[PDB]
């Protein structure tokens, strides 16, 4: 019932040129900009990844970004979102993803990153985001995705990490933040990504979870993150990537979702917003473009459903987890 109504004049064409122009010019130089500096490293990752998927990575500033990244690695080995901010697993992953896109991993101290990640694992197998101890399956994913890209998944207690993630699996086939937490598409992406990386997708009930995920699709074509919520273009990534991992991507109406995603574009400014007619941002621009790639858009590079990076990049580093057939 809760849903958007797409306008008859909503964009129905993919506007790559405008998106590339928008991201290439993002951060020049602004209130919400300023105000989101606490996530800058992830913001940089979102921008670089979407540009690379569109074949426009060259238009970004590699040299500047590599100096920024090195400046954000702390003595503990962890990486912060920005200079002067505190290290965290979120921005450690984002940094490693960026360096992988640029084939510049040894810009940072890899041994120390591995030690940092290792140190955040708890006795039950879970991971804290940082020294202050917040536990979330987001961080289980961040830890194993970071390690996988570095070729160091053996640094953590994998069986215990698996046990923890499976203890977050719910009655409906999905996954939440922590044991007992309600299922949410964002957490399902993290957990199915985790299970892909650790070769445990046989433990997912693909038919049950797949059904729960395809029921995210509302009459508008758009996807929400759990029942009775509004759709959001970023669920085009969270839901679709999960469905792809578990081999059930065809359970979505591809055409209606494509139409919804394109409607979220801003025809004047470029970029995508969470829903049609709202304010655009790099976060939603990445997830709209990546969702379209998962749906098979000709003009966009194929994207890894696990790592949200171009598949050609992961092929290069030889980390391509097997998905459910």
């Amino acid at each position: 019932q809760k849903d958007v109504t797409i306008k008859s004049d909503a964009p129905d064409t993919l506007l790559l040129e405008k998106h590339a122009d928008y991201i290439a010019s993002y951060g020049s130089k602004d209130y919400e900009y300023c105000m989101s500096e606490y996530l800058r490293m992830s913001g940089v990752y979102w921008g670089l990844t979407v540009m690379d998927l569109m074949g426009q990575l060259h238009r970004m500033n590699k040299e500047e970004i590599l100096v920024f990244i090195k400046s954000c690695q702390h003595e503990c080995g962890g990486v912060s979102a920005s200079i002067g901010h505190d290290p965290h697993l979120l921005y450690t992953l984002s940094a490693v993803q960026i360096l992988t896109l640029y084939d510049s991993i040894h810009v940072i101290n890899v041994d120390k990153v591995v030690a940092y990640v290792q140190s955040l694992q708890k006795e039950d197998g879970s991971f804290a985001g940082d020294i202050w101890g917040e536990i979330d399956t987001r961080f289980s994913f961040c830890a194993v995705a970071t390690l996988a890209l570095l070729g160091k998944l053996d640094a953590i207690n994998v069986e215990k990490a698996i046990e923890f993630v499976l203890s977050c699996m719910n009655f409906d086939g999905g996954f939440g933040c922590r044991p007992g937490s309600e299922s949410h598409a964002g957490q399902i992406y993290c957990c199915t990504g985790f299970l892909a990386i650790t070769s445990q997708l046989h433990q997912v009930n693909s038919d049950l979870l797949g059904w729960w995920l395809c029921e995210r699709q509302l009459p508008s074509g758009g996807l929400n993150g759990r029942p009775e919520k509004l759709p959001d273009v970023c669920y085009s990534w969270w839901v679709l990537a999960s469905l792809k991992i578990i081999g059930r991507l065809h359970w979505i109406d591809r055409e209606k979702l494509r139409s919804f995603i394109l409607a979220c574009q801003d025809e004047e400014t470029g970029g995508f917003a969470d829903r049609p007619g709202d304010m655009v941002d790099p976060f939603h621009t990445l997830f709209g473009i990546a969702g379209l790639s998962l749906l098979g858009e000709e003009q966009i590079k194929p994207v890894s459903p696990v790592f949200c990076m171009p598949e050609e990049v992961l092929q290069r580093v030889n980390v391509q987890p097997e998905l459910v057939s």
Partner: protein
Amino acid sequence: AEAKRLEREQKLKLYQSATQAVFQKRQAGELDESVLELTSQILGANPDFATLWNCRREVLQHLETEKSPEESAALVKAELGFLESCLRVNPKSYGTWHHRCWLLSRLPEPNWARELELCARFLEADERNFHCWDYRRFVAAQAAVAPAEELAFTDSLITRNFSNYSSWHYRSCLLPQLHPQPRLPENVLLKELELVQNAFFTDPNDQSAWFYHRWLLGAGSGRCELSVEKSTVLQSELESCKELQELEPENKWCLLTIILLMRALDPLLYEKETLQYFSTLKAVDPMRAAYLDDLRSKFLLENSVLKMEYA
């Protein structure tokens, strides 16, 4: 346009200089109340500035060692008030809820009953706020609240109104705790089927009841070694869904559930009807046509295996 633009240009400049001041003080090892004053000004509008919650914790830790017992107790009560004011403005910031957990976990005794009430309050505003449900489960475990009490909380909720998935999900975790095991016992399962059947007949829209019912259908041990009572209940549910199908012919949930009940009852005896219902369902829910074809294919193979088990 201009006055609104100029206003946030003023906000920024002050947010920027306060942020600069905090970082300058921290580098200088000045872990003091002013710090606390500066960060309150920033975190008010921007609670997702995680590093600043870290700064507050470092200060509170430092001041613990330097201040008297009751100066320290005063500082924690002020922090609780600050946190609640922050949650009012943005009740979904991970950092804010975690800072509250960090704080309460340190206290040797905290008032857990008060925290459960805070949860009740935020849940009556947004009954789907998962941060708050996560915090409630934290408080419940800390206070050692028994599953039965939390089960009573969910009953009341599901009654008040719809909106609803978060409360059924919680029930799904509580029930196995009350009836623990290395499945639900049938007496429990039957009571749950009655409760959920009430819900989705009271509001056929009510997608959380249908999801939970699908789970209950599979959580039975372990049938068809169906008891006469469960056979009769399921058959009754089947006829009630058919009645609802008449009242609400655009309702896909009731159609899917009719298929699932027939499967639960006797897949081979209901093969004809099952196939008929698949066609009808696909017409009313075309976006799910591929899922429905795969589910039907699965059921057709199950049926071949049952037939070939003849004997």
